[model samples]
Target: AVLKFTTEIHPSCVTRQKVIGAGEFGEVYKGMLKTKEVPVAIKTLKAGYTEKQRVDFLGEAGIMGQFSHHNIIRLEGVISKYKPMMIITEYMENGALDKFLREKDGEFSVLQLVGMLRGIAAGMKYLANMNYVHRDLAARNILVNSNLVCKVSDFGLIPIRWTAPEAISYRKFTSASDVWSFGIVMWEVMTYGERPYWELSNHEVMKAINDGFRLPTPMDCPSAIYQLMMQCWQQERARRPKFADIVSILDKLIRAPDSLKTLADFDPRVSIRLP
Candidate 1:
């Protein structure tokens, strides 16, 4: 049975503007809603798609439609009754956060970066409370709008670099596992979108995590934030902070800027070399 969460959209109302990107099912387009003159991102399910792919595509739409939070990507609706099944969401002008971060370089102040993390934590908190685990959480999956607001987006991947050790081992997903990935996201933001475990193979990274290794603090990363990052990397998922707890921690750090004065100790000897 198809999920009942999606609102049906008339295909005629959606006018395809241009192909912005492509997804697993098919091409993604920048489209307009004729009735409201609003722009939206449209993900299409290619023809000859199996019943399984259609279900999966629409299933994501269903999951997205139920979420109503500023920090989460807003789903506009779905066009399942038409020739090309489609999932629509609010178009994020700045696109993916990783690319944005790379383009901007060190433009954001540490507090501003922390503010971005707060937005992400707030979104994940909502997801956790909804009893949904964001199996894939990372800089690449987060979208940045024109206002510089970071909204959690996409529902895809094993993403070894972001996957928690427990998740990698057991294939079990939980809020705590998402928390683990959030720490990596924090690392990515602090380092201006550096890849986690730089240059390490997935197998090598997995082995290191299994052997109790964690990523080193990014250069000039604040002590308090780095501490929170380490808490997330706790070998036992039970020791990791919930997304709710993380929000409050970041809130406190943002308010008390002095709390960020002490930089987390970073040793290049232990850190994977950065080019």
Candidate 2:
């Protein structure tokens, strides 16, 4: 199922290229491949990465190869020669979802917002069906193209299997954990890409979440969307709605012109007028 494109050395393979971003293990570069005129993103792993990490990187590549969906970034190929192993992917002109939304303003209409969420939810549903859980499902990890289509990116934190029963439960990544993260992503979309802890620290956010606090309503977030966000972030993993269920809800909301109004009428909190 590999799409054939004129093959060029991945962007990271080019010497003296400009660095776009850096993470704990690698740096990303913006460059063009020789085979195709389109720009591409190249992520190269840092030196001294352990065998396990290398294996994990390749494993991610393999997974990406197997999974082909419009909403998920396509892994074009990999370069496994030496220390700077490269992972090439589709280039997203707009970068991260958060940054894109922030540039748009602090609000989007319900119709536009639902369309974004639908793309994300559809991608998640595909991943869940494949028995994979994306541990780091956040707005920063989602890429928006020039066409405004959303694609899930950065598969580094994906968990291959469910955690064992005896191990510490909360840290274990699962489909449910991904749901919680998806809730956060929803908040990001509604708030126009506000960081999850805009006014709170990581510790504070986690503490509040553990103590049953959820995202406060952004000034104009639709009530229905807010309720759906709450359901996704429920403390009890079992209480979180499945991705399929989320798809259904989003579909209904997308099709009905006055659905946002109906959602607000049903739940007062949907309007962000909570006392």
Candidate 3:
């Protein structure tokens, strides 16, 4: 019941140029498609892969090809069964979410940030409906396009700090774990690219959570969003709200800007580290 992709595009159609990014398999280059001025990201892989590996990689690409939502990164196509394997997707001008926010600083209003969050919530909801859990959810995993639209990227591939406690402890991935990682992503958005639990060692960050310490509200973050983040960090995963609640809450806030007026009164003396 898993998805797969087979976009065996002719290699001559894509004229690769610069190294824009990299993936687990290889580097991603920016390129033009068949004399078009439009740009695209080309993820490259070496040739001579095992038959099963090629099948598995292309299968994953197929699953990506099926994703179609404004808030989800779209797979343009793939060039395989050739010399260098390539996965082509729409190029995001703004690149990663954290870097974009950091560069803009406080330019975005609370309502605007909520808009970005709403899009992410919608994307996660779509995946949840398809019975897919994005095991990796972080600011770095979210991409921003030219129109300032934030789309969910790197679905369930890399496993790192964004992973939920249970996922790391028991290798379990559920909607609840995704919620936990989503909360961390919230922290990243609110803090404008600041490292999670700033100044704490990796081991200390998790240990602080084990010791019942939670991050205080980010400076200027709306109380409602902060409250939702805390709920997402609930030690007992069942306590977290579903993606439906997340999307609905964000939509309600957007429809009612007055809701953002209540600011969180976080004390600088307390530590901010949970989730």
Candidate 4:
């Protein structure tokens, strides 16, 4: 059944332009809403998809279409009335945040990095305000537009590397747990998309988190941003600052650039897992 919040577009209205990448559901394309002459990204389900798979594919569209925020990816609509059902969203020029940051490493100023984080935090705040919990928040899940603005994407859901210890033990997902994941995302940005925990295995990462071992500061990362990461990783979920608060903190740092002068302490040995 089609979700009420999502629009059903006629297949004739969408014209596939080019293959861009593959998604969880199937091959993705840079397409156009012919009727509106608007460019969009399209996800078409692979042939032979089962009923369960089709529902799961379209399910992402249902929730994503309901959110409207500058920092959140916009869901244009869906074309599910025919075979190879498609989900459409605004095309992101820069693709995923992780790879984009990696390619542009050393090119961005600290203030620019903070601006990216601010946009992401703003998106999370919107979700939080709507009483929606983003169970999966990460750099790889974020998309960057032509203007280098970061927008939260791929809400359709390992998370173990980014998960909270409480979530690992109890499978309890909340906005607080999302905050914990956001901390990891911050580390990802500061490190230019380096993998969390370096080469540590999932079991090792889990144990480390349980032992109160949070990721060390990324090179040249500011003290204020790292402090925010620590607060997000608070073992007691309630102690974590809400996304709204995170946005406020980032805004303050942006306004007072001098406040980011202090760099966070980082021990190279800890990151490499040395004794």
Candidate 5:
């Protein structure tokens, strides 16, 4: 369900209101588009770039347009075709899910958070179905609309953290790599925006990962959910579940909240002692 746009945009057509945030690619702004008063997000390139870098930045949009899943962000159109500097897309008033959760003070119940996870998993299912790898799939990159639905955004962005071992080690990326990231996102959600592996230095994280270390399950995270996260973090990427399977699992938890009662008690100093 992706989309493309014809060359019809004006600098006047857009009313930039606020800066959403900045990322490796560029700065994102909240804006209004056209007479319809459509809420839109405009991703404008960073300052002082050559034509080639600018063009390369927006090149992924064409691929993005072909992926029109509801749980994925919708790209409305490009602002300027010649040099085409800005990317216009639907705006999520609530903004990034991680910051939003922190503001709410980790108030999400197991069932409610699982529902959001279901939405993200469903989105990843679409991306996997399309053979697209979302290089960055952390909770911070996921945007939430006013309706309380979470949608995956910045599907592919420069690596910051939350990357798979293979990509970090060998520069290999695949749906498997994405599955690894999804595991990190799961931890982020369960802990309500708690930073992953906060105790480890960046250098140690890679070394510990190669040594087969995984983040301990977050406090009060459902055993079922933690099990899935551990599965995604499996050292052999090929063994991870497909997003389709992940969606089905999350769907079950969303439908039956009582299943969370068995969630494992977390001890950050120790990994879960599975039978």
Candidate 6:
């Protein structure tokens, strides 16, 4: 008599349905896998991606796989061999930070905003410490969950390319550069997700930043926070503060009740909001 081997399936292999959302690089689907029943967001590249794009997409997956931080989005796994390569990550129910803040309409209290900023700064600090620079660290890229915790997302733009060879001297990203981006993120939190150049044209915004232009003052933002933002947006990358220093400053603000009150006193829509 001949015996044949039969494969046994694990009970945890059952799959669950997930809702999809609008995605930039690819379509994002919400789904569950296995017995864990954990909610996950699945991102798949657009069909017919060029060879180079595929490589870049895989590269992003590889980088994300290596990172494990509370503030960073969790990468569950990847399925590249199948049609339309896919990457699964933790689902963020609150969605993008920009949208979440805007919905509040400047009604959030100072403590709430501070909590959001602290989370962002902490996430940036993790990336900086990991030798990864988030070239595009803006409110749009950050994701918030239902718990109000913020997680840094969109690793597609990491290691931002420096076009100005003479100015930057190299095509690489540094912690200081990330700090610069973090400052912009701070502006986003303070303004309830308003873009830095909402009032200016794209060209004007670029020119202004290049010429040391920054968000105006008395915009319901604390003096210390504004000072930090200005320092981060400095044209010269070397002048920006390190992640360690940023954490220290943020921690101090968190502890000082009076300092916290100052930020609360300002109207969130001073100069930026149109009457």
Best by lDDT: 1
1 or 6, which is superior by TM-score? 1
- Candidates 2 and 4 compared: the better one by lDDT is 4
Candidate 2 least-lDDT 10 residues:
159-168
Q: Candidate 1, 43: how far from true, in Å?
A: 0.8
Compose the digit string of candidate 4's lDDT tens values, residues 23-117. Answer: 67688899889754888999999788888887778777887878889999988888777878888988876889999989988888999898999
Work out the TM-score per prediction: 0.92, 0.80, 0.90, 0.89, 0.86, 0.78
Candidate 5: C-alpha RMSD after superposition: 4.4
Q: Where in model 1 is the C-alpha error above 4 Å? A: 1-5, 268-275
Off by over 4 Å in 6: 1-26, 45-50, 80-84, 155-172, 263-275
Off by over 4 Å in 5: 1-7, 21-27, 45-51, 82-84, 155-161, 268-275
Task: Provide the global lDDT of candidate 4 against the true structure.
Answer: 0.88
lDDT of 3 by residue, 222-255 (tens): 9999998898898888888899999999899889
lDDT of 1 by residue, 1-275 (tens): 35476678899899898998887878989989866589898999988998888878887888898888989999888988887989988887788999999999989888889999999999999999999888999998999987778999973545998988888888878999999999999999999999899999999998998888989999889999999998999989899999989999999998889998889888776556689
Over 1-275, each residue of candidate 6 has an lDDT whose tens digit, in order, gives 00011122232432436545644467677777453577777777878788877777777778787777777898777766566567677877788898888998777777778778888888888888888877677777888988788899983432122211122435456677677778778877887877566767655655666676666643667778878777777776676788888878888887894686554244345366577
For all candidates in order, the CA lDDT equals 0.89, 0.72, 0.81, 0.88, 0.80, 0.69
Error of 3 at 102 (Å): 1.5
Rank ordering of all candidates by TM-score, starting from the highest: 1, 3, 4, 5, 2, 6
**Candidate 6 weakest lDDT stretch, 10 residues:** 1-10
In model 1, pairs of residues that clash are none
Model 4: how far is 238 from its true place, Å?
Answer: 1.5
Candidate 5: the clashing residue pairs are 1-68, 2-68, 3-65
Q: Pick the candidate with the highest TM-score.
A: 1
Stretches of candidate 2 off by over 4 Å are 1-16, 23-26, 46-49, 81-84, 155-169, 262-275
Candidate 2 clashing pairs, residues 3+ apart or interchain: 6-35, 223-270
Weakest ten-residue segment in model 5 by summed lDDT: 1-10
Between candidates 1 and 2, the one scoring higher on TM-score is 1
